[PDB]
Design brief:
oxidoreductase; 15% helix; binds manganese (II) ion; transcription regulation; Bifunctional peptidase and arginyl-hydroxylase JMJD5; binds 2-oxoglutaric acid; alpha+beta; Jelly Rolls; 241 residues; globular; seven-stranded mixed beta sheet; chromatin regulator; four-stranded antiparallel beta sheet
Length: 241
Amino acid sequence: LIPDVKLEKTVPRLHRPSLQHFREQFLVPGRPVILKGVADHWPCMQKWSLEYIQEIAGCRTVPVEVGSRYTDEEWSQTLMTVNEFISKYIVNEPRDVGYLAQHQLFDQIPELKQDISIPDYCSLGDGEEEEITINAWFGPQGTISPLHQDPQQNFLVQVMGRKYIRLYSPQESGALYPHDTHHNTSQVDVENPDLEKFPKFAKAPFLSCILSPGEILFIPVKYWHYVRALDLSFSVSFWWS
Ligand SMILES: O=C(O)CCC(=O)C(=O)O
Ligand SMILES: [Mn+2]
């Protein structure tokens, strides 16, 4: 099912905003934004199909997550070839949901680095271009990344399919009942909250969006984010500082 994003506050969308504007209105204040017209002509957008990914990467071994990431004990990873993953969790009637998440596929397969680029906005950071972490997120409809926060800025680029994303600023942490302050994860199920056990969550303000191919979501450092895939999906994240 597709959530109704127009009833919720939508993440603003901007087409190729200037570096200065992005820095002053978004990076410095820590405000989410969607960048349009930047990655939509990346080669990956037209080249990366299920067939092409299976052809180039199908023999390489990757980690595959299964379980709810709400707690360490609730999930685990299995190392398997890309072909095995595609067969078991995408094409054949998947009883369980499997997710090739948070994997540095582009270090494993440098050719794929030719199909993507580093966003120009990353040059506004302090860190170097070499310490930027590029992660692949490839999985079926229905994958869910529970509400959590990360210690770096993020550009999340959608290549294949659509994702529903909810964002809560760092100043809402109280209403999100973190498991452990010291990357931190919420105890709440965004789309099915226990309203007795988590009363403060109902009124917490948030932004939401459906991110589609060619769009980039800027997730400010330590902004809380929740992600559900709406279709067979492939995203590329850029963690930078
Ligand atoms: O795409 C997802 O399922 C989650 C991505 C995420 O947590 C990130 O890019 O930092
Ligand atoms: Mn994250």
